[PDB]
Amino acid sequence: PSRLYSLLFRRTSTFALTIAVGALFFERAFDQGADAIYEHINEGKLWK
Amino acid sequence: HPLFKIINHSFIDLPAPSNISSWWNFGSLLGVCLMVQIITGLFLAMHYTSDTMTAFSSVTHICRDVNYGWLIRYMHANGASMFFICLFLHVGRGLYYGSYTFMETWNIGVLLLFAVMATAFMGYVLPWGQMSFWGATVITNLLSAIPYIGTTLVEWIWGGFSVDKATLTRFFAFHFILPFIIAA
Amino acid sequence: HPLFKIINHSFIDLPAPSNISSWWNFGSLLGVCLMVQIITGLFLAMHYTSDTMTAFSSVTHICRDVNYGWLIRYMHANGASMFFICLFLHVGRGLYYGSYTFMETWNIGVLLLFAVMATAFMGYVLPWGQMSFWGATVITNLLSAIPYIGTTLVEWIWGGFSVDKATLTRFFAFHFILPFIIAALAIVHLLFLHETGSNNPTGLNSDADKIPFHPYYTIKDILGILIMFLILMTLVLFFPDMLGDPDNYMPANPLNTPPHIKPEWYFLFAYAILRSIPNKLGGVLALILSILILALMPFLHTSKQRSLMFRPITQILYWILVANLLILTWIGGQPVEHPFIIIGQLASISYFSIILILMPISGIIEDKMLKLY
Amino acid sequence: GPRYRELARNWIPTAGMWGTVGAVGLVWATDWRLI
Amino acid sequence: EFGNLARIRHVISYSLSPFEQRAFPSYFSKGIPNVLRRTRERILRVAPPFVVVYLIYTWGNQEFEQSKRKNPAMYE
Amino acid sequence: LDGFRKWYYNAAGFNKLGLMRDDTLHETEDVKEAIRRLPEDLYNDRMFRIKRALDLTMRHQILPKDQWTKYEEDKFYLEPYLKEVIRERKEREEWAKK
Amino acid sequence: LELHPPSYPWSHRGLLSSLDHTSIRRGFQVYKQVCSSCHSMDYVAYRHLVGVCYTEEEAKALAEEVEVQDGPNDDGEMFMRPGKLSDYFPKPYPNPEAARAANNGALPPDLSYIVRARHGGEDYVFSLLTGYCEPPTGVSLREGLYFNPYFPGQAIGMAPPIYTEVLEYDDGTPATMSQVAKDVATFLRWASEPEHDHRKRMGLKMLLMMGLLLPLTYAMKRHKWSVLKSRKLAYRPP
Amino acid sequence: IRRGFQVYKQVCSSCHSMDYVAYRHLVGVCYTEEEAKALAEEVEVQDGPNDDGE
Amino acid sequence: KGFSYLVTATTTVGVAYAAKNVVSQFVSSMSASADVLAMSKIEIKLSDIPEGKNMAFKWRGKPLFVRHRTKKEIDQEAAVEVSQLRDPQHDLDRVKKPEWVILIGVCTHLGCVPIANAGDFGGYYCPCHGSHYDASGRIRKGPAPLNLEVPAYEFTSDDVVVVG
Amino acid sequence: LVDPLTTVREHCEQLEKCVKARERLELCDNRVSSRSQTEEDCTEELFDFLHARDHCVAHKLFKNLK
Numbered sequence A: 001p002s003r004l005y006s007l008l009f010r011r012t013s014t015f016a017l018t019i020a021v022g023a024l025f026f027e028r029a030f031d032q033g034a035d036a037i038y039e040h041i042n043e044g045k046l047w048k
Numbered sequence B: 001h002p003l004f005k006i007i008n009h010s011f012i013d014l015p016a017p018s019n020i021s022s023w024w025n026f027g028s029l030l031g032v033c034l035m036v037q038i039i040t041g042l043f044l045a046m047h048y049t050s051d052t053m054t055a056f057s058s059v060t061h062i063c064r065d066v067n068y069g070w071l072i073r074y075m076h077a078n079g080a081s082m083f084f085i086c087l088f089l090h091v092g093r094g095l096y097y098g099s100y101t102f103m104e105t106w107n108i109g110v111l112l113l114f115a116v117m118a119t120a121f122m123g124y125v126l127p128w129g130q131m132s133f134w135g136a137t138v139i140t141n142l143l144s145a146i147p148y149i150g151t152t153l154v155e156w157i158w159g160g161f162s163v164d165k166a167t168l169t170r171f172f173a174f175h176f177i178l179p180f181i182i183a184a
Numbered sequence C: 001h002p003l004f005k006i007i008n009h010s011f012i013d014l015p016a017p018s019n020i021s022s023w024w025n026f027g028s029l030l031g032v033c034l035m036v037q038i039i040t041g042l043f044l045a046m047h048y049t050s051d052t053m054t055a056f057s058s059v060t061h062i063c064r065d066v067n068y069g070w071l072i073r074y075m076h077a078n079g080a081s082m083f084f085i086c087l088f089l090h091v092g093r094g095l096y097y098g099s100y101t102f103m104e105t106w107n108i109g110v111l112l113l114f115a116v117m118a119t120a121f122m123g124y125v126l127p128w129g130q131m132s133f134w135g136a137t138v139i140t141n142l143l144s145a146i147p148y149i150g151t152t153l154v155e156w157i158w159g160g161f162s163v164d165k166a167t168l169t170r171f172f173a174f175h176f177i178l179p180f181i182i183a184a185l186a187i188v189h190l191l192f193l194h195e196t197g198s199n200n201p202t203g204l205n206s207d208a209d210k211i212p213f214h215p216y217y218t219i220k221d222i223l224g225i226l227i228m229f230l231i232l233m234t235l236v237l238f239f240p241d242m243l244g245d246p247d248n249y250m251p252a253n254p255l256n257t258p259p260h261i262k263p264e265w266y267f268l269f270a271y272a273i274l275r276s277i278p279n280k281l282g283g284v285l286a287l288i289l290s291i292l293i294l295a296l297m298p299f300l301h302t303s304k305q306r307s308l309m310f311r312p313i314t315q316i317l318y319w320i321l322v323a324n325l326l327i328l329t330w331i332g333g334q335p336v337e338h339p340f341i342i343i344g345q346l347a348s349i350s351y352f353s354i355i356l357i358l359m360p361i362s363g364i365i366e367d368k369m370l371k372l373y
Numbered sequence D: 001g002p003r004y005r006e007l008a009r010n011w012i013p014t015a016g017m018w019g020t021v022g023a024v025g026l027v028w029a030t031d032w033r034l035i
Numbered sequence E: 001e002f003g004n005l006a007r008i009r010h011v012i013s014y015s016l017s018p019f020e021q022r023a024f025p026s027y028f029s030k031g032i033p034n035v036l037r038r039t040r041e042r043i044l045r046v047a048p049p050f051v052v053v054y055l056i057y058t059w060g061n062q063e064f065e066q067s068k069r070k071n072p073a074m075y076e
Numbered sequence F: 001l002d003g004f005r006k007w008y009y010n011a012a013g014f015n016k017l018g019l020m021r022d023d024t025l026h027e028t029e030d031v032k033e034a035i036r037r038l039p040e041d042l043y044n045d046r047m048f049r050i051k052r053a054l055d056l057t058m059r060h061q062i063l064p065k066d067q068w069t070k071y072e073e074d075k076f077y078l079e080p081y082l083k084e085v086i087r088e089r090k091e092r093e094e095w096a097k098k
Numbered sequence G: 001l002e003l004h005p006p007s008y009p010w011s012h013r014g015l016l017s018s019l020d021h022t023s024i025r026r027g028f029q030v031y032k033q034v035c036s037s038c039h040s041m042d043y044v045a046y047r048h049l050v051g052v053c054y055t056e057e058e059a060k061a062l063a064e065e066v067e068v069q070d071g072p073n074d075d076g077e078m079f080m081r082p083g084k085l086s087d088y089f090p091k092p093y094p095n096p097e098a099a100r101a102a103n104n105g106a107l108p109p110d111l112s113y114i115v116r117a118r119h120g121g122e123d124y125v126f127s128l129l130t131g132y133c134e135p136p137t138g139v140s141l142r143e144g145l146y147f148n149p150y151f152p153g154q155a156i157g158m159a160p161p162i163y164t165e166v167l168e169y170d171d172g173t174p175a176t177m178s179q180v181a182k183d184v185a186t187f188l189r190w191a192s193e194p195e196h197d198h199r200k201r202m203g204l205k206m207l208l209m210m211g212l213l214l215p216l217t218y219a220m221k222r223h224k225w226s227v228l229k230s231r232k233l234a235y236r237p238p
Numbered sequence H: 001i002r003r004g005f006q007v008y009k010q011v012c013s014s015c016h017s018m019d020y021v022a023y024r025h026l027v028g029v030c031y032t033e034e035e036a037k038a039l040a041e042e043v044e045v046q047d048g049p050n051d052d053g054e
Numbered sequence I: 001k002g003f004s005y006l007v008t009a010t011t012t013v014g015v016a017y018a019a020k021n022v023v024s025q026f027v028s029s030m031s032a033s034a035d036v037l038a039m040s041k042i043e044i045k046l047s048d049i050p051e052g053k054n055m056a057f058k059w060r061g062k063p064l065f066v067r068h069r070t071k072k073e074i075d076q077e078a079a080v081e082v083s084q085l086r087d088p089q090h091d092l093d094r095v096k097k098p099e100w101v102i103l104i105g106v107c108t109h110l111g112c113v114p115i116a117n118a119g120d121f122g123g124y125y126c127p128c129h130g131s132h133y134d135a136s137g138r139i140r141k142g143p144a145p146l147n148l149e150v151p152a153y154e155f156t157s158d159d160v161v162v163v164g
Numbered sequence J: 001l002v003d004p005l006t007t008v009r010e011h012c013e014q015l016e017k018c019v020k021a022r023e024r025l026e027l028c029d030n031r032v033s034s035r036s037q038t039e040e041d042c043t044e045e046l047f048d049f050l051h052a053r054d055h056c057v058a059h060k061l062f063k064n065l066k
């Protein structure tokens, strides 16, 4: 998409904003998704 | 040799002003004092234990049972005092003779001054006397003044609710490591 | 700007050969490993106590009560192992590609290698386990070899009749202070090299083809750092005790001695050599030479070609040298009994004969084959 | 060759003197009583 | 530094912009052939030595055990 | 011996990068003096061959088999110039001993 | 010369496989009722359990179930109080010698890190506890000894401590000798590494992050290195 | 110093503690080796475990 | 020149004398601390050990092997060829009492603890490198350089041994 | 209650590989019986037999275990 380059990649400042914001949310998603996996892999064994 | 060049560029063939007085000695003295402190500090570190049960006992063991251990300990303490005497006279020379127009040198200097003050503070906390403990609490408390994140920062440094072993050990680590950063 | 001048000179606008392989990453990895070790070591030093009553208790307190303290401790141990892996591959790159003709860089290197081995030895003594105490005694009594100067010197380091608290505390102080000397020696190592520039795997003058370092060998070093971090963490977070020893999880008992005692993997090749020589002194000397033979290496280069890319017979001799280095690493592990001993004796004889005798003769033969000699 | 021989013969006496200094220095420093 | 490194003459050097060229041109297309080309060029000079290592290793281990093994005639 | 020298020339592998034998010599003081005494065209061909070999080693490639350097064809150009450097070097040395 | 314990299919043997916490709870019960009479889990304190297999208040219960002395009192030395969540497990035989005496010269080795300290510990432990077989011909163990093919020398002072139905599992899982040895090996393992589970989660996140980041950094390197890798050199002598 | 050590030994020792000073430190200062040995053996230690950890 | 240089030479000695002194005191620092030296103390109980047994009290931070020997034990050690011994020291040469042998447990080789009641010479064996010591503590087989050391003990009684 | 190990053991035990191993041990046991006045023991035979037995049991004890 040429909207990306114009909105996200083009200006270094914008290139940054997207990275930081994405990272801020990525952790939420990654942790959540990862935990789901880990747990299931050993669903039976965990306190609860 | 490529290394030799550095020596002949900073200590032998360096063009120096012919009329600089004895005050210009003082900075070199500071460097010597730094080495002296490091050397004495290393020979305090072979017998000092950073445990609140044994820190005072280790200091008394240095003074009483190690051969010439009292000499190295009091050389370390009075060398810290000599370091601050030479530091104050170095800063006074810089203020009087207009040497602060070397702005980058002056700013690296005031960074060195902050690092030396922090090193001496944690070093004075290290023998775990009555005065060291109440002094530490006091200045650590200074941080609590911070408007919003103060409490956390203080507790972080203390490593607990109040200065206790948690502090002593991390203060030993930081007091060990900062004079090499001062040398760099 | 004075600083930026220096910065631009050693990392950005430094002219580097365009064709250096991934092996040239390893030295930068070593520097990263050094910082990693220092950082992890600093976070071990805020809770470790160098007292023989409390050292094992402080290590268990780090592993059990400090938040992520097990992570920092096992990162420190496996980072020492990763340091020695990268060190061995760095030295092997220097031996294979003829980089020892940079003689000052090579000598500062072998000084750095001696300092790193001493630092790792005293660091392994530091947790005050069963294995640490018997290892220290053994490796220190080794110093008791020297007839007139040795005995006293040993107790001098031991600071007493036998290793005891006196040692632990001074070993904590040394082990703390030597990696900063290693960092300064590494700065001297980098200086003695930029005067000459890095070598290339073809061994030829790469002045016609040099590229910047910022966009070409920086992202390459970043990728190598990422791969090395993948291997370290997967050697801490999944296989954390693979490289260690189980008997170090017992407290130091002077009355008992671990039945099966062995140096860590990296110090074994030397261990084998020491055990091989019947005479105690002989062993100590050979051991030292084992490391020192490298320093001696730039005076043994008798070929008109710098690298081994175009030298197949010396390539075969080099891989035989790597082979019996692995053999000496295995033997050290094996106990004292037939036929491990004989292999050890031969492997040491073959190691010294390949480095001292076989490679210059092979280089002379290779020069004769190209109608140069 | 002959020239280097002259050089050695000319500096060895000086070298011996240097070694002598070291002997005194090392011994004095080592406080080795045997000496 | 650059500019004073070496003297070459008449060596033209063409190149392309990173974004203008495919990132992994024929990566597995020729990569595999090349990697295979490479191995066959040094395999005979690398593996042979280590092969013998596996061998000594094995022989060594087995021999030791046999040494530990009780001598039948022993005690009989 | 001639066929075994050709087999060793193939096993050395600098012909696959298009190099000559004299390109592979380690540049000591005598070798750099011999390189400095080369004519301009031979020096330019040597620098281009070294640059092409470095580029091929960068991309982990070799030349096609028709472009390799035939053992028979390799020319020992630096050799003549080198002998002199060594000869002169030795002469000065002996004279030193005088 | 020692028997080398075989590999058992543990539930935590896998690369991302955590510990079975019910087995750690059962093995803690096994240690409390059998192993605590001679061995000392010095480095494991009641608080440690909270979060693994016992809840805060629940642990408090266990804590309240032991008498731990408080040395410094206005004028006294010990009114052992209800052990707290901060108290460490109670070591039998306050002095080492005491046990030495009780165990006939042997010193039960503190089982906090036994699994980590014994080569192939988890297996060894299981094997030793279950390896109490018949002594062979010619063997002459000294007074107060027993025969286990694994123990170094095959002469462990420890008498066989797990007789089938030695203790009853509160969960009710049949207390067969084995079910008890497997539970105590899991527990001792946990003891020697309370972070086993947390770590493996960090390792899973590390593998996912490296699988994301390695091809992307490789792609950036191959972008910035394509320029050269496409460079075409040509020699054009005049 | 010898007279002042006597004072402590007799009058002020029962309530104050000279922990960091040991009978060894006195030798060559106030007393000889045998005099300090007799002074140390007049006093009695009460701790340190025994075969029974007693 | 001799006046000016004599001052340089004079000064040097002075500095040299101070420099050796400063450097000397530091080396002394790393040396035994007064307390560590105060360990010459030691005690043992003969009744503690019966024939054919060894006992150690970690004297001076090292295993102080104290052993009792049997008629046979004492008989063989004497039979051992002193000259043929790696270290010529007849069993009795290291023991005031044949029934009583006392040794220090540091392998002449690399300093491990010899393991009593194991080995091919009925005395000791060091699991570190295979040194076999006879009951006399003499190195008989292996790579250990010299016999185990016999501390200068004191047989005050058949029931008490000061090792001294 | 029957310890699962006993079952698993029985199975692996019945195996001939193991049976003959035990028999070899038996010959050894007997050797020491007649050759009673010696120092030869059957420890080594014991271990090898067990290693086999256990390896198998170990292969199959955890499944039964709960």
Ligand code: HEC
Binding pocket: G030, G031, G034, G035, G037, G038, G039, G103, G106, G107, G108, G109, G111, G114, G125, G128, G129, G151, G152, G155, G156, G157, G158, G159, G161, G162, G184
């Ligand atoms: C009444 C005594 C006694 C009981 C009950 C006892 N032990 Fe032990 N244990 C010992 C002694 C004594 C040793 C050390 C003996 C030796 O190493 O020779 C020991 C050692 C051990 C070792 C380490 C052995 C080694 O090689 O270092 C483990 C593991 C162990 N015991 C587990 C257990 C478990 C699990 C239980 C019960 C569920 C248990 N013990 C019950 C006396 C006992």
Ligand code: HEM
Binding pocket: B034, B037, B038, B039, B040, B041, B042, B044, B045, B048, B059, B073, B076, B077, B079, B080, B083, B116, B119, B120, B123, B124, B125, B126, B127, B175, B176, B177, B179, B180
């Ligand atoms: C890396 C070098 C150094 C090391 C290893 C070191 C080590 C130590 C140690 C172990 C102590 C505790 C023993 C004692 O009480 O003296 C100590 C105390 C101290 N250090 Fe340092 N030190 C170093 C550098 C410095 C420097 C540069 C200063 C001055 C800025 C300094 C000032 C002090 C002070 C004031 C004390 C307390 C002295 C006292 O007990 O009264 N140290 N140091």
Ligand code: HEM
Binding pocket: C024, C025, C026, C027, C028, C029, C030, C031, C087, C090, C091, C094, C099, C100, C102, C105, C106, C108, C109, C110, C112, C113, C116, C182, C186, C189, C193, C197, C198, C199, C200, C294
């Ligand atoms: C402290 C550990 C060490 C570190 C961090 C280190 C790091 C480095 C680095 C970063 C380089 C530049 C080459 C490159 O990165 O491409 C280098 C070059 C070199 N190192 Fe090391 N090194 C270490 C130990 C050694 C040792 C022990 C030796 C000697 C055996 C050695 C010999 C060399 C040589 C000869 C070179 C020049 C090779 C070249 O760049 O072509 N180094 N080192």
Ligand code: HEM
Binding pocket: C034, C037, C038, C039, C040, C041, C042, C044, C045, C048, C059, C073, C076, C077, C080, C083, C116, C117, C119, C120, C123, C124, C125, C126, C127, C175, C176, C177, C179, C180, C244
């Ligand atoms: C200034 C830099 C360094 C500091 C402050 C430092 C500090 C420490 C401390 C306090 C310990 C004891 C804690 C523990 O063992 O868990 C330790 C252990 C250790 N250090 Fe370091 N260290 C440093 C650099 C190094 C280096 C460069 C190496 C490698 C040569 C190294 C290898 C080790 C090893 C092998 C251990 C023992 C690991 C184990 O317990 O298994 N350290 N370090």
